[PDB]
Design an enzyme around this catalytic site. Structure first.
Site, PDB file in Angstrom:
ATOM      1  CB  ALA A  98      -1.391  -0.178   1.152  1.00  0.00           C
ATOM      2  CG  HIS A  99      -1.392   4.663  -1.400  1.00  0.00           C
ATOM      3  ND1 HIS A  99      -0.944   6.326  -0.818  1.00  0.00           N
ATOM      4  CD2 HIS A  99      -1.817   4.389  -1.478  1.00  0.00           C
ATOM      5  CE1 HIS A  99      -2.280   6.190  -0.323  1.00  0.00           C
ATOM      6  NE2 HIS A  99      -2.887   5.216  -0.947  1.00  0.00           N
ATOM      7  CB  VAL A 100       0.049   3.767   3.530  1.00  0.00           C
ATOM      8  CG1 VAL A 100      -1.793   4.321   2.931  1.00  0.00           C
ATOM      9  CG2 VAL A 100      -0.302   1.632   3.800  1.00  0.00           C
TER      10      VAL A 100
END
EC number: 6.3.2.14
Length: 343
Positions: A312-314
């Site tokens: 996830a980009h997070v």
């Protein structure tokens, strides 16, 4: 007493005290094994906290005032000791400027844009894992209260980046990078280049975009999940702050508002794909669980390499993903650079 050369070494074998306090501050902050005079805060793990503990440490160890454009921009360790002990006598566009030269004077230059984060000094991990110390310059800067950074940020940030590119060269093979918002950003800036009269070599952009359709950014209202935003903010507040205590609510307000407006403006932003050569990483970790292609082969770009990895980009900007794509970044950039695969 007359002026003294103060030794001033190219890196190794510092002074008897001048650089001693510097090399010690680093190895005592993040270095954990540093003792050079030509070190690079960026590659050392510089940040609002790290650079704060060091800058303030030196100013208190030299009885002087060092911090503003005199830490990870003035020049380097050696110089740092020559400015806090001898005198500034220099002018280096601090990070507060539009651009921040992390490495200029090696060979293969790499324009890193679309940081999607407060600062862009935590990318050295990849730039150091892929190359020894090639040329790298990321367009990033602080935001005390950017009035246009709300929605007009895409326009401002665009001019800055391009300005630097067209400033170093009119056209030619350039390798760009993107993360989180890099997808949309790269898209627009890309079309502007191909139309500007230049040719893009290869722009890598990872985040999330499986074989089906656009992202959830199409409608922030009915797309902004309490998790995605809670994650990106949890990693940014846990990374920038690090429970250190350097900024009351100034930086915190800038970071929270930076990602908030960016993640809320990404819906109004433009999205124009290019028929060149780019890479797109999928986020299996957030798979829509509804993908159902049918002989598409990614019709978006004339040629690209779509990968599949649960991420996830997070939590993709972590030191784990960077090291993971170290050696695989050479064979990939070497196979796409020119001609087909070699190995």
């Amino acid at each position: 007493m007359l002026p003294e050369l103060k030794a001033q070494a190219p890196g190794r074998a510092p002074k008897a005290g001048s650089e001693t306090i510097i090399a010690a501050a680093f190895s005592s902050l993040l270095g954990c094994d540093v003792q050079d005079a030509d070190a690079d805060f960026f590659a050392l793990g510089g940040h609002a906290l790290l650079a704060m503990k060091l800058a303030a440490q030196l100013s208190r160890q030299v009885a002087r005032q060092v911090t503003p454009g005199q830490v990870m921009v003035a020049s380097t360790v050696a110089k740092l000791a020559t400015i806090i002990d001898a005198e500034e006598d220099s002018t280096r566009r601090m990070g507060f400027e539009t651009i921040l030269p992390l490495r200029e004077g090696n060979g293969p230059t790499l324009f890193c844009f679309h940081p999607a984060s407060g600062f862009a000094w935590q990318f050295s991990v990849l730039s150091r894992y892929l190359d020894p110390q090639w040329s790298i310059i990321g367009i990033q800067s602080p935001r005390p209260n950017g009035p246009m950074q709300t929605a007009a940020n895409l326009d401002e940030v665009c001019e800055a980046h391009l300005a630097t590119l067209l400033e170093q060269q009119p056209h030619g093979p350039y390798y760009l990078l993107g993360y989180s918002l890099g997808g949309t950003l790269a898209q627009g800036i890309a079309a502007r280049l191909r139309a500007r009269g230049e040719q893009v070599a290869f722009l890598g952009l990872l985040d999330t975009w499986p074989p089906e359709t656009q992202n959830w950014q199409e409608k922030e209202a009915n797309g902004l999940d309490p998790e995605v935003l809670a994650e990106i903010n949890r990693e940014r507040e846990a990374f920038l702050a690090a429970q250190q205590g350097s900024t009351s609510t100034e930086l915190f307000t800038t970071i929270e508002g930076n990602y908030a407006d960016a993640v809320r403006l990404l819906t109004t932003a433009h999205s124009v794909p290019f028929d060149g050569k780019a890479t797109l990483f999928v986020a299996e970790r957030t798979l829509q669980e509804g993908m159902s292609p049918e002989r598409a082969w990614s019709p978006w770009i004339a040629e690209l390499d779509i990968y599949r990895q649960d991420c996830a980009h997070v939590d993709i900007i972590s030191p784990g993903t960077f090291e993971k794509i170290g050696p695989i970044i050479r064979a990939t950039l070497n196979r796409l650079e020119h001609h087909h695969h070699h190995h």
